[PDB]
Symmetry: D4
Subunit: 121 residues, 8 copies
């Protein structure tokens, strides 16, 4: 089953980071969420109730990304995957990618970050 629902390049200004100065200044966090969902029923019915609504997922991601500052991207993604998996039984698995395009790293690069994949129990 290779069907997926996705939200790409969601950007949020947050205050996460292990560094005091990061928590103070903040920075933009980029998030990609890919959900493993069987979309054949919805494909047949065209009824919004047979799939997972992207809008609701974005709201979840946003509440976590723009909420309380934490140290790690690993913890933020863990919270998001866990939030999506808990509320939607149709989601078989949640992939969360978080990128800091402008972390406190003296250099030239496109971004740094983490990606996790959590199956829905």
């Amino acid at each position: 089953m290779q069907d997926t629902i996705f939200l790409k390049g969601m950007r949020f200004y947050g205050y996460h980071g292990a560094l005091s100065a990061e928590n103070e200044i903040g920075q933009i966090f980029k998030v990609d969420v890919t959900l493993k969902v069987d979309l054949s029923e919805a494909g047949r019915t065209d009824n919004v109730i047979d799939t997972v609504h992207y809008g609701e997922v974005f709201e979840e991601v946003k509440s976590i990304m723009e909420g309380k500052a934490v140290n790690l991207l690993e913890h933020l993604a863990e919270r998001i995957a866990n939030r999506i998996n808990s509320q939607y039984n149709r989601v078989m698995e949640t992939k969360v990618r978080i990128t800091k395009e402008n972390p406190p790293i003296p250099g030239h690069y496109d971004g740094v970050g983490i990606e996790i994949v959590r199956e829905n129990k």
Copy 2:
């Protein structure tokens, strides 16, 4: 067998969406279609009749994307995969990705959407 025929970033202005206001205003839908097709005969012959012509596939996608408004991206992709699989026996499997880069979601992101993979029976 890893050969594929592809059509990337096809853009169509349509009126699909579960929201009345979406159906009224419309928006751009981005579509990626990847077809699993054995291309060694055509690679040998160079005869257009031994492969699936991209132009015809684009026409199919377009007729569905620019036709009657439906609620879901899942239904549109289901219709496209089913259209391509039905008309081309050489297509072993059809992957359809549809992205709403500007849905009615208050936020900053690159796009939201779905992706399905349907084997040709």
Copy 3:
């Protein structure tokens, strides 16, 4: 005097537009603000008090862009130019460019919008 202070590509999700459905759904508005300010005193002193702080300008633009929905981009820009000119005497002139990259226009384009230039009286 060709010195300027600028804020490029500020994006805000708003509900402006002459169309009911626009006011309901909203869309992203892109804003560029260019301020004609003599920067030689600040260039000499390095004292933040001798120039116009970008951060404060962004806050002004944001309050207008994310506030009450209006019909026209012309009115939004008029309000922004007028806001910046009123609060900063050092600003000799304000240029405001607002772009709707995804208006209710059935077609393929990069964006539509307006640009105004208002001297500070």
Copy 4:
């Protein structure tokens, strides 16, 4: 008076070109239209009737770009400027830029084209 109304990156698939093969195959034409219009009345009133509506301008450009094939970009732009100037008295001047990003020129480049500026008589 430096106020302007603009439409950027409008893309149309057309058949214009001095070459038979161009007329047969077609290609994408990119168009930028910038209109010199005094926007202070609309800025004050917020009444759509005090400005030139972008949507109507796009429709004009489209009718010309997707209509009968002509040889030159110069002729297409002349027709567009003349169309906009004729129908909108508030437009003091019309700038039309047309780019062929993929003309029949053996080489590597971003685009070729013309730009004209026509005052409204």
Copy 5:
């Protein structure tokens, strides 16, 4: 063994295509070549003779892409894979992706094309 040598976005102006007018006008062809090669010996030695030189591969691709016009992308890629596999025993497998970003297809898209994967016998 997941090591690879790659050449991305190689662009050539050619005359391939099943349509007479294409053969006459030409267009840009974009090519991506990915080679499965064990790079640990070279990683150890740092001796250019223990790997496949990208420069030579580009020359091969170029000779085929800028040579005689053929009808299909499938045939061009077949010729390239076969050329690379024949001359380099260290290449375990060759992936060739060819994209026509501007084919004779009336529409808005990013590109169309094919991708093949050929193991070296």
Copy 6:
């Protein structure tokens, strides 16, 4: 008179540069040419003979850019402007911009170069 004919982002691999190693290795040179030409006759007539054909201009630029290596971008642009001005009396003035996106400069930047403007005598 603000009409112009333009050729943007023309790329050529050349061997120009004041450094021996540059002459040996080469690099990509990006060229923008803007020609001041009155386009109203052509706009009226639609006859290709009343304007300057972009294709011929590209050929001129190419012959100079891909010809004998010289030390300076200033000399290459001088030769191009002079070539275009000499052969086309309708060109009132020629602007030539040449950019070395990857010169032998240890750093991170988008490009370096020169731009000249030469009126046709």
Copy 7:
């Protein structure tokens, strides 16, 4: 005289900013330098000694951008313009644009900054 020598998108990781936390963490600063220089002698001679060498200019910009942290972009640009004007008599005027693409501003934008123009006395 419209000839210019330019350096675009020079990026440096620095510690400038009026905020303590900025000085601590740092961020990327983007710089554009445009120099008004008469390039006809060099265009004629092709002798590197008749123009201003971009490489030397980049070194100057770099020494200032990667040196001691200051509060304002206005002061950094003033120092750069003054450095270039002092060392090169052929430079008739120096334009310096500095952009903070990721300042401590909670929002979504492309960049903020200043631009100055200083004639060489």
Copy 8:
């Protein structure tokens, strides 16, 4: 286990290359590093000590990329993978991709390079 820590588009100006002239002039090297690391402990704890810090990894990559010039990209990547695997036991496997976007290859392309994957022993 599909969790990863990544650093994308790290750019360094170096002097690597099998060609004398490359070693003399240098060029920009683009590096992508993807690390297979189990991030569930850190996801739970939010303690920076339970994961691999990106900042330290960037420093390692940088020391190798900006250090002594070597002939091959294969050798540079081998050194990086080996450096990361040696210092971090939590890294189960290291993927290193190095791209020369502007090698001494007369042509038009996006980049050439190699990618290796090394499991941590």
